[PDB]
Design a protein that fits this description.
This is part of a larger assembly, with chains A (96 residues), B (234 residues), C (79 residues) and D (418 residues). Chain A is low in regular secondary structure and 96 residues long. Chain A has one domain: Ribosomal Protein L15, Chain: K, domain 2. Chain A has one helix and three strands. Chain A has a three-stranded parallel β-sheet. With 234 residues, chain B is of the alpha/beta class. Chain B is built from seven helices and nine strands. In chain B, a hairpin with a 5-residue loop joins strand 8 and strand 9. The longest helix of chain B is centred in the last third of the chain and has 17 residues. Chain C has 79 residues and is mostly loops. Chain C has one domain. Chain C has a two-stranded antiparallel ribbon with strand order 1-2. The termini of chain C are far apart. The chains are: A little secondary structure (96), B alpha/beta (234), C little secondary structure (79), D alpha/beta (418). Chains in contact: B-D. The structure holds two RNA strands. Chain A: GO terms for molecular function: rRNA binding; structural constituent of ribosome.
Chain lengths: 96, 234, 79, 418
RNA sequence: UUGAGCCUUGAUGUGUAGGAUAGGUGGGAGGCUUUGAAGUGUGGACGCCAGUCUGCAUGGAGCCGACCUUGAAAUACCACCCUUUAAUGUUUGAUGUUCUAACGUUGACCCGUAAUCCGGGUUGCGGACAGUGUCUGGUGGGUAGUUUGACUGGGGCGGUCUCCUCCUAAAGAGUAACGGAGGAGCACGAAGGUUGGCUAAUCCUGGUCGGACAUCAGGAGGUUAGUGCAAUGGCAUAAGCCAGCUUGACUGCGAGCGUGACGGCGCGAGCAGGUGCGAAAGCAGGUCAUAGUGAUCCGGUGGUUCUGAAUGGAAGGGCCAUC
RNA sequence: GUUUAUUAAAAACACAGCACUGUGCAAACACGAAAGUGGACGUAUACGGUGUGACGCCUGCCCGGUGCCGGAAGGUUAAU
């Protein structure tokens, strides 16, 4: 990725983001990872029996995806506005 | 000239060398000690560093504090284009630009504390040429060169603590009289003590509080069981 | 003198003519170092910084001089 | 006798910025005036340097009106208040202005300021454009009621001289002497250039400069954040000369930078007179004949003339004044195509114009392209047909056959015949 | 012997006013400072000494300022630390001198050893030095690594390198050359904004002083003038020119375009919000247009919770703005 | 006299003589991180360095005393 003694284009651009580290401990699980609910209860530490989900989890959100039509738990798991919408409609705990 | 520095040596040898005293005990002491003939002043002598910035160091003024009581002062709220129109809604005190304008330009004044927006402030509390007071005078700064007017009136109505000398990086603040009660005084200190920690964001040394000392006059003074430090605000 | 301090670099003028697509901005006549020698008019407000015909929302050039004399008048008539 | 705006506002900051914006006249240099309409007036410019307090104190008492300055971000400042008080007591009128006014429309002026033992603070402009108009008008009105003070011969200008040297020696002190013999300080700054720079000043009409960056006894208003800016000044010192003086020490002089400095001087194309200052304390067997010898051999054909002064005694004082004049006469010498052609013939006959590619060249006249630093342009054969060396040989010859205690003289060659 | 680091005494602060000598008082005109309190040197704004001059040597007035004025201030009782200056406590470093005990001893001898080495011992002489170890300033082509462009009608020489306009430039366009010509490295808050208004040069002719006008008067003339600073293109709907009034050189966005390989650069109505001016329509997003400058780093300034490592704060970093 | 062995013998290099400086012994200095060694079993008529080049002949200018020369800061002479 070079260009001789015409200046680096990316040394013709600046840097600007910033890391989070929290980031690496924020996982991202799906609606259809309630497929792997493996116990009627959606619990972070059951989903590691799926191994669908981080070792060093501290955080996670549950996102949209297909449906499974079953009671679920979800506590200490974030769930999105749209995500929670239909798994509400299957019954199951889901208050947090 | 200087005969012998003996009378001051024996006296300072009694009660200063950072002999830390209960704040209240100090005040109990403070009225007399060496023959000072009447009840005197309660002071805090706070030592701040540096030159090139101030936040409340060498202030020829008075600032609002938690526990404003000690004195209550005369107050007029000058409401001109600012946070004045919020003050008009507030309706505490007297709010009016052109009538209080007149009252400012009349020939006579007594509304010491100008909570102000642009025109009034310049008159009252600052003026003279070689200004300076009969022993006390209407003062200028009251944080309305940091204008707010409505909320300002609540704080203002209540009262206010004046301190002043000149130019040294060590900020003295006269806490009150001994015709004010011991525990109300303590609270005055604590209030100023919380403020100061607050004060100064501009790095030049990250703890700006050295000595909180409490003192009166006639070689009589003590130190505080220092409690201004950095930990949050205490 | 003996100089040769040179390089030319504005370029571009008169791109297209008449029907030009039609578009919210035309180039129309961005036509440079002038304000007249291609004179503004029609379907388009203002003579651009460098004097631009750029639609009122749309436009084929209508061209064609007017007044009792004077100018040459470039006009824009909507597409 | 005559007014001066006389900026003050604390020792430094944007204080200077404002003077440049009020002036426009360079090379009158310093003192120096700000022009408004018809009338022009001067401008003048804790724990601070003792020397800097002495000059500043010297400025304001002769000062005839004063201008006290505050910044946008500046407000409160007891020190400012002290300077303001001093001014009242001693008694001259002061107006309170505020620099690059900013804020967010006029607000915090006038409110703090009434305590300043001064009233109405006018806010200014310098990077916008309205706020200068009021100040200039205010001053104007009293000042309009009043109306206060506002070949070419060698004597058509008064002799221009600089005093350049090391970034070590207390040259500024030597500068104080040269201007003195009166036993008085003189490095009181006024402002009249574009931006924050620097003193050339004149006494006896004739100009002296003080230069380099620290050790010079440059402890001034400040303007050279690095080693660079000062150099921008010394190059000014070149522009202005027909004479430059090099101070060197006998105990830190001829440093590497310094010998380069002399080499540079040769470029600078201006007359060299060599000064050694603070030379009454040196050891009885001097180190220093050899130090003169190493510079001599490089070698500078001029007239020397060595000076052994001190700024803390003075010995050399007359001999320096004298040497520059003599040097200027030779340098500025009335010249003339005839003289040049006549001495030249001898030279070429004697030692042989160079031949190039079995074709012998041809010289055929010289004329003077100016005299002040003497330049000649000789029309002969092509540029490369001579080496620079023979040019110099013929030049050196002229430098020899008609006295030049002055500056190096210059030779040129043009072609047309071949 | 002698510098200075610190310690607490010293007392006060020039414009009319202000007695002079107005650094800096919580609170502010009782403190029964009891003693019959004082005007007499340091101090003090400043020597502008005076006098007022000092908690600063007299006893002479209730215990006593022997209450304020008046200016900005100044008199009941005093308070808050500075500049300044001692006296005293010191604390410490220099020099001065002498010493011996480290240490040196390429003095002399004894001895292992009928060994110029060395070691030990004795004594003589030097002596807290000298020297060396660290740290540390100056010097240092002696030694060391390398740096010293490119365009180029051979190169070096010279001159030149960015940016703009014009022509060459072959009529979309775009454009070489060591082609030809010229310039630019800003200026400017009015030269901006907006309303309302106003209409040259150049020449004739005639008139005080009036000269090739200086104003005045008319006539001719028809923009050849003048444009913020080239030069060109452009310029009366003036952009000019004159004046009133303003601060849009606003803010947050942006259909959609032109024009650059890319870095990117330029134009752009409208919406939205807030504004400004204008009677109202309406106009205002810096300048007649075209030049007036530069990536990326890394650091400075201000703002923000965004980040933030046991855990809370806190630092630094990101962000937003700006240098 | 000496010399570029394996191009170049000289006007080059050398040289006495002279000149200049540096060095008091644990010497200068030189090598050798240093120890040590050389310098020297010597001892300023030397020792080391440096430099000039027989020889003869061309005149090589001491700042102290006191004075002088330029200069300022002073002294001294002035108005006072």
């Amino acid at each position: 990725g070079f260009e001789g003694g015409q200046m680096p284009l990316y040394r013709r651009l600046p840097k600007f983001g910033f890391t989070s580290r929290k980031a690496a401990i924020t996982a991202e699980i799906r609606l259809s990872d309630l497929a792997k609910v493996e116990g009627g209860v959606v619990d972070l530490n059951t989903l590691k029996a799926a191994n669908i989900i981080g070792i060093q989890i501290e955080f996670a959100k549950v996102i949209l995806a297909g449906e499974v039509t079953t009671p679920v738990t979800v506590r200490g798991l974030r769930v999105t506005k749209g995500a929670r919408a239909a798994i509400e409609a299957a019954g199951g705990k889901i208050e947090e | 000239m200087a005969k012998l520095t003996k009378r001051m040596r024996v006296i300072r040898e009694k009660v200063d060398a950072t002999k830390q005293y209960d704040i209240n005990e100090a005040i109990a002491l403070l009225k007399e000690l060496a023959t000072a003939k009447f009840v005197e002043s309660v002071d805090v002598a706070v030592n701040l560093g540096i030159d090139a910035r101030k936040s409340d160091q060498n202030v020829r003024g008075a600032t609002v504090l938690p526990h404003g009581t000690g004195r209550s002062v005369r107050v007029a709220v000058f409401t001109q284009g600012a946070n004045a129109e919020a003050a008009k809604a507030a309706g505490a005190e007297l709010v009016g630009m052109e009538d209080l304008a007149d009252q400012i330009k009349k020939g006579e004044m007594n509304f010491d504390v100008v909570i102000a927006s642009p025109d009034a402030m310049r008159v009252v509390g600052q003026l003279g040429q070689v200004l300076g007071p009969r022993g006390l005078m209407p003062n200028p700064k009251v944080g309305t060169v940091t204008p707010n007017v409505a909320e300002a009136v609540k704080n203002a109505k209540a009262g206010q603590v004046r301190y002043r000398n000149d130019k040294n990086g060590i900020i003295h603040t006269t806490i009150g009289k001994v015709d004010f009660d011991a525990d109300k005084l303590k609270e005055n200190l604590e209030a100023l003590l919380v403020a100061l920690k607050k004060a100064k964001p501009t790095q030049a040394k990250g703890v700006y509080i050295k000595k909180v000392s409490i003192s009166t006059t006639m070689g009589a003074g003590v130190a505080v069981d220092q409690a201004g430090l950095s930990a949050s605000v205490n | 003198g003996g100089s040769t301090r040179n390089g030319r670099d504005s370029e571009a003028k008169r791109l297209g003519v008449k029907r030009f697509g039609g578009e919210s901005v035309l180039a129309g006549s961005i036509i440079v170092r002038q304000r007249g020698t291609k004179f503004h008019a029609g379907a388009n407000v203002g003579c651009g910084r460098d004097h631009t015909l750029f639609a009122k929302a749309d436009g084929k050039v209508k061209f064609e001089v007017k007044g009792p004399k004077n100018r040459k008048f470039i006009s824009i008539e909507a597409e | 006798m005559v007014p001066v705006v006389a900026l003050v506002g604390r020792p430094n900051v944007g204080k200077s910025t404002l003077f440049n914006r009020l002036t426009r006249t360079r090379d009158a240099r310093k003192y120096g005036r700000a022009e408004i309409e018809g009338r022009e007036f001067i401008c003048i410019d804790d724990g601070v340097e003792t020397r800097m307090a002495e000059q500043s104190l010297l400025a304001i008492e002769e000062a005839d009106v004063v201008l006290f300055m505050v910044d946008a971000r500046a407000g409160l400042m007891p020190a400012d208040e002290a300077i303001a008080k001093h001014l009242r007591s001693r008694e001259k009128p002061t107006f309170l202005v505020a620099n690059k006014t900013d804020g967010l429309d006029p607000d915090q002026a006038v409110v703090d300021f009434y305590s300043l033992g001064l009233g109405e603070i006018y806010p200014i402009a310098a990077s916008h454009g309205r706020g200068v108009l009021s100040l200039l008008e205010h001053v104007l009105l009293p000042w309009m009621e009043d109306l206060a003070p506002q070949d070419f011969d060698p004597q058509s200008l008064p002799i221009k001289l600089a005093i350049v040297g090391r970034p070590n020696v207390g040259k500024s002190t030597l500068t104080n002497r040269i201007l003195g013999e009166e036993r008085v300080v003189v490095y009181d700054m006024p402002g009249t250039t574009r931006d924050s720079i620097y003193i050339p000043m004149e006494r006896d009409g004739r100009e002296y400069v003080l230069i380099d960056t620290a050790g010079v006894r440059k402890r001034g208003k400040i303007t050279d954040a690095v080693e660079k800016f000062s150099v921008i000044k010394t190059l000014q010192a070149i522009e202005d000369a027909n004479v430059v003086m090099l101070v060197i020490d006998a105990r830190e002089g001829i440093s590497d930078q310094d010998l380069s400095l002399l080499g540079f001087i040769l470029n600078s194309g201006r007359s060299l007179v060599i000064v050694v200052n603070k030379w009454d304390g040196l050891s009885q067997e001097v180190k220093e004949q050899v130090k003169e010898t190493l510079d001599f051999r490089l070698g500078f054909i001029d007239f020397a003339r060595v000076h052994f002064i001190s700024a803390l005694h003075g010995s050399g004082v007359g001999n320096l004044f004298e040497s520059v004049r003599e040097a200027y006469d030779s340098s500025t010498r009335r010249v003339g195509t005839s003289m040049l052609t006549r001495i030249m013939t001898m030279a070429v006959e004697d030692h042989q114009p160079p031949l190039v590619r079995g074709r012998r060249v041809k010289l055929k006249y010289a004329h003077a392209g100016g005299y002040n630093p003497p330049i000649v342009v000789i029309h002969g054969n092509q540029v490369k047909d001579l080496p620079d060396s023979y040019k110099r040989y013929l030049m050196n010859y002229f430098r020899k056959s008609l006295d030049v205690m002055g500056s190096p003289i210059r030779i040129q060659f043009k072609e047309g015949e071949n």
